[PDB]
Amino acid sequence: VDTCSLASPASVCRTKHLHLRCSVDFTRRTLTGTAALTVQSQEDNLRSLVLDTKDLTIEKVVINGQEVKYALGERQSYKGSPMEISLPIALSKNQEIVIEISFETSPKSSALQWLTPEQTSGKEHPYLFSQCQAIHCRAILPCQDTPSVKLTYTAEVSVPKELVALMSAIRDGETPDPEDPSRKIYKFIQKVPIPCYLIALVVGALESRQIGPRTLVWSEKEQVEKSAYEFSETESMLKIAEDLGGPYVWGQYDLLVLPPSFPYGGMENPCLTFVTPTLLAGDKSLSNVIAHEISHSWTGNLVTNKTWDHFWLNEGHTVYLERHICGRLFGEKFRHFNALGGWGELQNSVKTFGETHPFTKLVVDLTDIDPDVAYSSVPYEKGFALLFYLEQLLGGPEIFLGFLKAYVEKFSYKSITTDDWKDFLYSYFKDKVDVLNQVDWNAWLYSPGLPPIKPNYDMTLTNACIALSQRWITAKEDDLNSFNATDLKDLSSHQLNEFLAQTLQRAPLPLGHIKRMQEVYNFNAINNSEIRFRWLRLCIQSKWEDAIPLALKMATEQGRMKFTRPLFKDLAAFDKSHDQAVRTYQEHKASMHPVTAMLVGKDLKVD
Template sequence: MKIKPLFLSLAMAGMCSQAMANAIDQNSYANLDDVVTTHLNLDLDVDFADKQLEGFVEHTLQWNNSKSRTLILDTRDLDIDKVMYKDQSGNWKKATFDLAKRDDVKGSKLTIVFKNQAEVVRIYYNSRPEASGLQWLTPTQTASKTHPFMYSQSQAIHARSWIPVQDTPAMRVTYSARIHTPKDIRAVMSADNKDALYKDGDYIFDMPQAISPYLIAIGAGNLEFKAMSHQTGIFAEPTILDASVAEFDDTQAMIDKTNAMYGEYAWGRYDLLMLPPSFPFGGMENPRLSFITPTVVAGDKSLVNLIAHELAHSWSGNLVTNATWEDLWLNEGFTSYVENRIMEEV
């Protein structure tokens, strides 16, 4: 079987929708058979003092069951303030909700009940300092030693610790966001980051391609940007920016070679976010903005296969992925193969 037709046929034929309909994800409470979120809109304040994100998320809903009036979301260690929904007349109404007792693995089931099927539901909430999907660093824990730093790691089931969401790879969602930070802090996300090129503490993001919730990502800190090519660039703390650019300036060549093998790159830009050394992974394939550990900046490009791997996920994983986490091998197995093909070419 040729890999190129596999990726393109699965992605373009909408096989993820079929998987969503048939998947039973033991790690999620979501009632996908009844209702699915098609778009998320986030409005969040990054509070370094209290180590929390605070604000609201809006879900645009698609109902699959005409009789259902209930939306079930995944959460973990979130405080839910209130829930409002917009009915078919465009009026905002208060919704009834229940936050269940916490399960050690899955977190707390958030059950929202509407009088009528909602088109949009808005949940006001805040994360807690112990959120499993967020890391809060003091200035002394960063490379620059001057500003605090925060980043997310949503894979596998950690998006629910900072967003009330149907936290399963069996669904895909577009998203937009407005993120508020101190004025000397730059925020970036796994989305279109053109607004993040101007550091002002108020950032707008848009992700027009549908992705699984584990690929929603955020970072905020003393970040600067430097382009490597017309399609690639690096966000990093000033102390490691130039070294990172020198190490990974072959990224465009990797994209060009992979385009030829597996079809055109579907995500627009491909930028990198260099994280503090405490990032516990080599990299994370967040769309448009891979999160990368600075420990691979070796000075001799000997570890750039990590970039090839995260780039490969742009085809195998981010376009087509496993429906449940029991089958993660489908994601990482194909990606490891594509990584090796990229390295052979470059």
């Protein structure tokens, strides 16, 4: 059962298609229109059905050209309000009908962020973007907001004519709005059935540049050139992913570089991956995020978790494919370096939550839990560690990649559970069932903490990071003069980031050590968001007051939760910056993404 949805389950009825006709009103901060759902009954004598909604105003529901009765139930916190619709005629099993709902969103819709012109790069036009994963589609339109249902969709979006709309779909033309010549209607078609969390919309002063045979990069004019260069390896990564997963079925693979408040590193919206502008490091070093979103075109978008309790299926397999893409491009020693880095992030998550915390389990129980509050590196890295351990146990990467491809082929266009995955793993590896039976399945899937076995990792690229981190940790005052810029001469940006992560695991360090690190390495000059984030956390945790303005600026000038949440938490934990962190959150709260504002408030204990 999907404990995060209040809608009728897939066993009662299934939405097959959505035809959305809407208009974006920037003056009211509302999306208004009609959602026409083609719904197929799965039961005999079906007379009503329930949809998910959250802060939606319903004007009317039309079936067969006439208004029908509906009722909105009491709100159930983050789940929203159930909408029960009374069907005019009882449906037989497999009968399909179209239900047209006229609705309008709330300006406080948790799916949307409305930006004023001052919040954009161009400063002249406003901007809107959505983020539906996990359960925010219900805050845009009435739907069965569960990944256990997959539907196709078509959309027609009216916007001010100076702006551009894009969606997680193939572009299907644009025309002036026949009802208003100051507006344009943009059309879209998504012919591959998707779960509704993959519905996405952006409206803004967007420009595009072609960077591959099936890829345009989209952003405001000021970021086009930098984005085209940053993401130039996209076609190469798509070709490797097709070799590992099978055909790319989505047609286009475009990228949208969002404003800095985009809450995630990337969102795998089909046909149009959304990415944070914090990837714009200038040297392509953060391109693993693109490899990750590309990989979701198979693991997540084609094979999907049936409920959010099985989210690790989506992320674990995607991290596994992501690391194979980067291993093909940069070598097997690089794949192991990134895999070992991932184990260290899993160590940090388990330490943060606590080793017995229910969110450190691979398969979770989200009954009465807001998915946004559960979100962490555990499903990604505990999921990856299980697959990497099975790869080692079952004969290596070539053999395990055969399983991955067969798994994608088996479950394409379906929504599955951990038991479906395990049953297929046992079926595919029938000649190695004795090896599979040695796995402690109960501990790996259902127990909290670090996994029961740590995989084997090549240490070649990690050794220099560990050695430099240990030199700093073990240094006394009289050793500080031995450090010098030459210590970093043979380290890649990835290795500098790993040196900082290793050191941050032992923070705090003495203030004099951190001051010496800035003296000889000049980490304050580095703009790479991952390195800067770890360096500023190391400074703040080591109680360097000089870092307070730098950390507050990074926390507020961008809104990627991976960076903003720990920076605000570190600033709140440092007595010297505590009041400033709380005051800065209070002043920026109204202008923040709604989910990020909620999570930073919980982290800071500010209501």
